Design a protein around this ligand. Structure first.
Ligand SMILES: Nc1ncnc2c1ncn2[C@@H]1O[C@H](COP(=O)(O)OP(=O)(O)OP(=O)(O)O)[C@@H](O)[C@H]1O
Ligand SMILES: O=S(=O)(Nc1nc2ccc(Cl)cc2s1)c1cc2ccccc2s1
Length: 289
């Protein structure tokens, strides 16, 4: 069918900068005709052309256009003018999960469980569509007005080809603290690489910092491939067990991966015993304190 009229910059009143990326800026904007607020990601054409970033922009648009699930930032529209590309995104009013980890220091068990469950639910959806995120981290897990998660940053995601039953992706992307050992050693990532990142994130929610810590990337890489980390005291025992079943060097042995028979066993883990999985995005999140 036809679609709505293509939008233009003059259709919006732009407000504050929400954040700045290496080759993008996200600005809060109100659509004049509706009074709706959007986070509009803006890229300068000559800059991403000069700096060979066009593939990432195309990737972000293509991957986001495939998503239809409440735990992801939504791509509503795109438009361009002579100088710029514009992505109209849902506005995640409460910002990055990382902000809350820093502020509060350590999530309690109820909050760790709830937010872990939402991330697991989101990954189940993404992996079911054959998509690897590859840069899952608290900075990329935003929070909407109701404090549900909104995962973002899909420019470095990968749609695995169904036609070839593709399992491995060859682009080297990610963030050192959360990068999987297989990417470092085998030079490819798989869906299970996101489960490794999940393990790091669960650890971080409880411990306050992610498990592989150092002042530079190479030192972090060295720890990752040796599985060199420890748990702080008082780390919730069932959460520790879960993390130990995710932070596994062999990607085929991580709870939740295809070779471990998928998300059923992961959702069945004792840490999640009280979770109602079916309708998390309609549940009231526990207050973060
Ligand atoms: N949909 C959104 N709603 C609210 N805030 C957002 C949204 N998308 C991004 N932001 C904020 O804007 C910041 C900049 O995002 P952008 O994707 O342009 O760069 P980045 O991913 O932070 O940086 P880099 O691309 O260099 O890794 C984000 O870190 C986030 O805090
Ligand atoms: O189909 S696209 O891949 N075409 C593109 N045209 C350009 C032009 C200049 C630059 Cl720097 C990148 C792209 S890429 C595309 C359009 C668009 C608009 C807004 C947000 C993302 C994208 S991707």
């Amino acid at each position: 069918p036809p679609q709505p009229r293509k939008k233009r910059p003059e259709d919006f009143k732009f407000g504050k900068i929400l954040g700045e990326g290496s080759f993008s800026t996200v600005v809060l904007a109100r659509e004049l005709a509706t009074s709706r607020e959007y986070a509009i990601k803006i890229l300068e054409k000559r800059h991403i052309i000069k700096e060979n970033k066009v593939p990432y922009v195309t990737r972000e648009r293509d991957v986001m256009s495939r998503l239809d699930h409440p735990f992801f930032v939504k791509l509503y529209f795109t438009f361009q003018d002579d100088e710029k590309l514009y992505f109209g995104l849902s506005y995640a009013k409460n910002g990055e999960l990382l902000k809350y980890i820093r502020k509060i220091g350590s999530f309690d068990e109820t909050c760790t469980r709830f937010y872990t469950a939402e991330i697991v639910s989101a990954l189940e959806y993404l992996h079911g569509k054959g998509i690897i995120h590859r840069d899952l981290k608290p900075e990329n897990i935003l929070l909407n007005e109701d404090m549900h998660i909104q995962i973002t940053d899909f420019g470095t995601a990968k749609v695995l080809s169904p036609e070839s039953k593709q399992a491995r992706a060859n682009s080297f992307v990610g963030t050192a603290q959360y990068v999987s050992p297989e990417l470092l050693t085998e030079k490819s990532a798989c869906k299970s690489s996101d489960l490794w990142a999940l393990g790091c994130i669960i650890y971080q929610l409880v411990a306050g910092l992610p498990p592989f810590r150092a002042g530079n990337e190479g030192l972090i890489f060295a720890k990752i491939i040796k599985l060199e980390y420890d748990f702080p005291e008082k780390f919730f025992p069932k959460a520790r067990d879960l993390v130990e079943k995710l932070l596994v060097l062999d990607a085929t042995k991580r709870l939740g991966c295809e070779e471990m028979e998928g998300y059923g066993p992961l959702k069945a883990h004792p840490f999640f015993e009280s979770v109602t999985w079916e309708n998390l995005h309609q549940q009231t999140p526990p207050k973060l304190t």
